[PDB]
C-alpha cells in the first residue's frame, strides 16, 4: 500500500471514550491530567463526555452515546483526520452489545495510525511523551493513490 | 426504552454500498431504477459511489472507501438522521477484513429503524413500495430521554 | 458465480422471528397487518410463534426456540427454498448467547436473495409493496453448477 | 434448566463435515474405518458427502454445501434429535466466510450433548469407544419444560 | 502441510475447564469418574481447579481464572505439548466476555490434534476409550518444517 | 474489582508481534530504534522474532508462530507478569484465521494494564516516553482477592 504523511497539530484533538465499568478509571485519569488536557481539544461519546464536563467543568464536544452511534461518529472523525488521539477504555471483562462498533473503531484508529490507549498505563505513557505537545508527523495511507487503483 | 417519531422526507437520502463481488449486481439495479433514483439524494462509499456516477452520470455524494472508514461515515450519518434508506449489498460468501464495520453499520440501521436492503429482492420490494416517495413517520428511539436516564 | 431463477409464490411462506425485547414490536406489527398476513403461510421460532398464535388465533408453524436450534431450522428452510420472506426483529441493544446462529441466519437470507426485514420500517415497506401478494422472480445462486465445479 | 434423557441408537446417525483443507484427512479417516462406518447411517454436507461416496462407494445422505446452508441443515437435524454423532473437521488455520454457521453448528452440538469430534485424535477416541455400537443414554435439555417457562 | 507424530503418554495430562453454569455438570462428571481420573495428571483454570480439588480432594494444578488469562495458559501448554486431553465445558447458552479466549483455546486444541470434549457425552466417550490409559501416537503439525518455510 | 500494584522494571520485557503485511513496518521501526531496544529484553512470535534477529543481530526470545499458539504464549506471559510492553502490529486490512487469538491477546494486555502499541504512531509515543527507560509502578487487578471471592 502507498503511504503519505500527515501532521498531528501541537494542539491535539483528543477523543475520550469509556465503557461503564471503566468510566471511574477514565474520570480519575482525566482529573489527574486536567491541567494538560485543558490545552487540547476534547471530544467524547455521549455519556462519557457529559460526565467529564459535568465533573471537571472542561469543555467537551460530546457525540452520541456509543451504542446509539457515537463510536462510529468518532471513527468517522478519525478517518477524516479530525481526531489525533484516541483514549478508549473499553471493558475487557464484560460483553457489550455493540462490540462490532467497538472493534471497528479500534480497527480504524489502527489503520489511520493515530496514538491509541485502551488502558491507563498506555494512556499515561502517551500523555507523558515529550512530543505530545508538539507537531508530529505520522505515516498514513495515501488514500488518493489507493482509490485511484480501485478505479483503474 | 422510550420511543419517539421522525419523518422520512418524500425526497429520501439514500446510501448505496456494495462489496466488490456485489458491485455489478448493485450497478445493474441502480441503472434499472435510475429514473426513480434520480429524484432522491444519493450517498455511497468511496469505490461504489465513484463507479455509480461514472457509469450513470448521476450525482453521488461519495465518502471514504468502506475499509478506510466509509462504513462508519455512513453509520454516523444514519445515527444523525441524515440517511433515510440504506442499500447495502454486502458479500455473504467472502470474508471481509472490515467485518466489524460491516456488522456495526447494519446494527445501527436496525437501531434507528430505517428501511434497509441487503439483497436485490429486498431492494426491489422497498423501492416499489408506495411510501418510498412520500413522507413517512417512523418510530425511533428517544435519545433525549435515553441519555437523561444514563446521566441520572 | 452461476445464478439461476426461482419464483416466490403469490402466497408467501413467511418466517416470523423476534428477540425478547423486540417481541412486543413484532406482535403489534403482526396484529396491525393480520388481515393480510392471514392470506399467507406463517412460520416462526418457538416462543415467537406461540405468542403470536396465542394472541391472534392465527395458525403459526412454530419451530424450536431460537437458542435451541430454531434459527438454524429456519435457515435450513430458507436454503431449501421453503421460506420466501424473513421478518427477523433481532435485538441490536443486547448481546445474545446464540449470536452466531443469528448472524448465520441473516447470512443465508442474504445468499438466497429473499426479502428480509430486521426492523419495523423495513417490514412495513415490504408488506406494502404492490407485489407482496404476487409471484415474483428472484435471482438465486445456481447450486447445481456450483457443486459441479467443486467436484 | 430441567434435564431429561434421550437414547442414542446402537446404529448411529453420523454427520460428516470437513472444510476443504481438512477433506483429505477426513477421507483417509473414513477409509481406514470404512468397515465400521458401514454399519451406521451417514450424512454429510454437499461436497464432503459426495467426495466420500464417490471414493468409498458408501451411501451418504448429502445435504447442501456448508456455505449454501448445509451446516444449518445439519444443525437443525441435531436439534431435532436426528443426528447422534458429529465429525466436523473444521479448518483452524484459514478464515471461512460462513464462520458464523460453523460456530452455530458447534454451539448446537454442545447444547444437545452429542459426541463431537473436530480433529482426528478425538474422532479415533470416539469411534474406538466400546459404547459407540450400543444404545447410549445421554442427558439433553428438557425442551417441553423450557418452552413452558418462556410462555408462563 | 507436512505432519509428524507425538506420543500421548499412558498417564495423560488432562485440562479441566468449565464456565460457571456448566461447573456443576463437570463436578458430577469428575466425581463419577474419580477412580480413573486419579490415575492421571489434572490441570484446570483457577475457579474450576479449586472447586474440584476442594470437593474431591484430588490434586489439581490450577492456573489463572479463564477471564484473567487462564484459557491462554492452557492454550500455551497445549501448543507446547504439555496437555494431552482437554475437557472444556463452555456455556453455549450465555455470552462470555472472554469469548475470543474461549474460541482461541478450542482452535489450538483442534490444530494440535488432541482429544477434546465440550459436553458430557463426548467426555464419557473419550474417557471410556481403550487407549485413554495407554501411550499412543497422534499426528501433529511438523512445526520445524513449517517455520523453516516461513523463513 | 480490588486493585493492587506491580512495578515495571527499568529493563523492560518487550513482546514484538506483527502480521505478515505489517512485518516490514515493524522491522523498520525496530531498526531505527535498535540502540534503545538493545537495552531491553526482547520476545516475539516465531516468524517475527526470527526475522528481527536475522536482520538486526539482536537477541530475540522467539516463541511459536502466532497461528500455531504464539499469541497465547505471549498472552500467558503477560498474565503472569513476565511481559511489560506489547508491540503488536496486527493487520487491520486483512482477515486472519486466528483472529480470536489476536483479540484474546489484546484483551489480556488491556486487562493487565501494560503499555500496548498497535501502530507505529503509538509505538513511537511509548518508546519516547520517560518511563520506558525507568522503573514505574502500575495498578493491576488484585487476583488473590478476585479468586478468593469466586470461591466464597
- CATH class membership of chain A: Alpha Beta
Write the element-wise H/E pattern of chain A from the N-terminal end onward. Answer: EEHHEHEHEHEHEH
What is the helical fraction of chain A, as a range of percent? Answer: 40-55%
Query: How many whole angstroms does the radius of gyration of chain A measure?
Result: 16 Å
How much strand of chain A? 15-25%
Shape of chain A: globular
Strand tally of chain A is 7
Distance between the termini of chain A: 15 Å
Q: Which structural class fits the helix and strand makeup of chain A?
A: alpha/beta
Number of domains of chain A: 1
Most extensive contact: A-B, 37 and 37 residues
CATH superfamily of chain A: Methylglyoxal synthase-like domain
Placed side by side, the strands forming the largest sheet of chain A appear as 4-3-2-5-6
The assembly state of the depicted protein chains is homohexamer
Say what the CATH topology of chain A is.
Rossmann fold
Largest sheet, strands/sense/barrel of chain A: 5 strands, parallel
Indicate the CATH architecture of chain A: 3-Layer(aba) Sandwich
Give keywords.
homohexamer, 152 residues, alpha/beta, Rossmann fold, 5-stranded parallel β-sheet, two-stranded antiparallel ribbon, 7 helices, 7 strands, 43% helix, globular, cytoplasm (chains A, B, D, F), Methylglyoxal synthase (chains A, B, D, F), methylglyoxal synthase activity (chains A, B, D, F), lyase (chains A, B, D, F), identical protein binding (chains A, B, D, F)
Amino acid at each position: 500500500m502507498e503511504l503519505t504523511t500527515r501532521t498531528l497539530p501541537a494542539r491535539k484533538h483528543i477523543a475520550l471514550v469509556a465503557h461503564d465499568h471503566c468510566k471511574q478509571m477514565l474520570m480519575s485519569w482525566v482529573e489527574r491530567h486536567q491541567p494538560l488536557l485543558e490545552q487540547h481539544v476534547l471530544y467524547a461519546t455521549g455519556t462519557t463526555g457529559n460526565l467529564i464536563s459535568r465533573a471537571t467543568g472542561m469543555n467537551v464536544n460530546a457525540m452520541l452515546s456509543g451504542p446509539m452511534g457515537g463510536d462510529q461518529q468518532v471513527g468517522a472523525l478519525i478517518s477524516e483526520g479530525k481526531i489525533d488521539v484516541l483514549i478508549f477504555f473499553w471493558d475487557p471483562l464484560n460483553a457489550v452489545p455493540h462490540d462490532p462498533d467497538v472493534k471497528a473503531l479500534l480497527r480504524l484508529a489502527t489503520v489511520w495510525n493515530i496514538p491509541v490507549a485502551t488502558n491507563v498505563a498506555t494512556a499515561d505513557f502517551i500523555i507523558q511523551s515529550p512530543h505530545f505537545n508538539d507537531a508530529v508527523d505520522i505515516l498514513i495511507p495515501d488514500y488518493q493513490r489507493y482509490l485511484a487503483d480501485r478505479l483503474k
